[PDB]
Design an enzyme around this catalytic site. Structure first.
Site, PDB file in Angstrom:
ATOM      1  N   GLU A  51       0.832  -1.215   0.000  1.00  0.00           N
ATOM      2  CA  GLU A  51       0.000   0.000   0.000  1.00  0.00           C
ATOM      3  C   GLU A  51       0.860   1.256   0.000  1.00  0.00           C
ATOM      4  O   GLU A  51       0.604   2.208  -0.748  1.00  0.00           O
ATOM      5  CB  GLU A  51      -0.961   0.037   1.202  1.00  0.00           C
ATOM      6  N   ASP A  89      -7.279   2.832  -0.236  1.00  0.00           N
ATOM      7  CA  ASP A  89      -5.936   2.681   0.288  1.00  0.00           C
ATOM      8  C   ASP A  89      -5.130   3.985   0.293  1.00  0.00           C
ATOM      9  O   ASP A  89      -4.261   4.148   1.153  1.00  0.00           O
ATOM     10  CB  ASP A  89      -5.165   1.607  -0.501  1.00  0.00           C
ATOM     11  N   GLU A 102      -6.830   2.269  -4.874  1.00  0.00           N
ATOM     12  CA  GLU A 102      -7.011   0.929  -4.283  1.00  0.00           C
ATOM     13  C   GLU A 102      -5.947   0.062  -4.890  1.00  0.00           C
ATOM     14  O   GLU A 102      -5.775   0.070  -6.108  1.00  0.00           O
ATOM     15  CB  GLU A 102      -8.364   0.365  -4.693  1.00  0.00           C
ATOM     16  N   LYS A 115     -10.993  -9.040  -9.774  1.00  0.00           N
ATOM     17  CA  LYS A 115     -10.719  -8.149  -8.658  1.00  0.00           C
ATOM     18  C   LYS A 115     -10.562  -6.712  -9.151  1.00  0.00           C
ATOM     19  O   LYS A 115     -11.034  -5.768  -8.504  1.00  0.00           O
ATOM     20  CB  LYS A 115      -9.452  -8.619  -7.944  1.00  0.00           C
TER      21      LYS A 115
END
Ligand SMILES: [Mg+2]
Ligand SMILES: [Mg+2]
Length: 170
Positions: A51, A89, A102, A115
């Site tokens: 992240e 994120d 994200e 996803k």
């Protein structure tokens, strides 16, 4: 085993950080004594590394406090309408342009594709509502195929992972 635990703790303890969030996650890992807990907190650390890398690479602030989009905008000075609940994120507000980021890892193409669509749709559902308060959303979806990152060397990454998984076995 005690040798293996000492090894992964030595590896992680050397990872130098610049923020309370990654510092805290190191602490969470380094105090564990049980294999399942060392594994869980170690893998969580690597996930946070991804992240932070993604945020750095894309010029976003890391959402380390799990702010919703309402909170992100409010903290910047902006009022929002009713929004779907989304905790990204990373984020950046530049003028009236809001980037929301994200990131995820999927190692199989079919799963990556699914996803990617799921995370894109999660952010896209905010666009019209944000446009009603003159905010232009740019949804950034940073899909990766691995956990390799710029925070720790790849060999440390592998050694940490290999050793943590081996501890579940005895
Ligand atoms: Mg997240
Ligand atoms: Mg994510």
């Amino acid at each position: 085993m005690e040798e293996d635990i000492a090894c992964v703790k030595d590896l992680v303890s050397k990872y130098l950080v610049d923020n309370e969030r990654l510092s805290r996650q190191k602490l969470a890992f380094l105090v564990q004594t049980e294999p399942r807990m060392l594994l869980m907190e170690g893998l969580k650390l690597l996930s946070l590394c991804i992240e932070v890398d993604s945020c750095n690479a894309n010029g976003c602030e890391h959402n380390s406090e799990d702010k919703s989009v309402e909170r992100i905008l409010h903290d910047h000075g902006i009022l929002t309408p009713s929004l779907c609940f989304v905790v990204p994120d990373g984020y950046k507000l530049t003028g009236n342009v809001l980037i929301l980021l994200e990131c995820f890892v999927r190692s199989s193409p079919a799963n990556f594709e699914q996803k990617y669509i799921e995370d894109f749709k999660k952010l896209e559902q905010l666009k019209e509502d944000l446009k009603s308060v003159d905010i232009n959303l740019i949804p950034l979806i940073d899909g990766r195929t691995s956990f390799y990152n710029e925070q720790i060397p790849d060999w440390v990454n592998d050694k940490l992972r290999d050793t943590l998984f081996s501890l579940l076995k005895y």
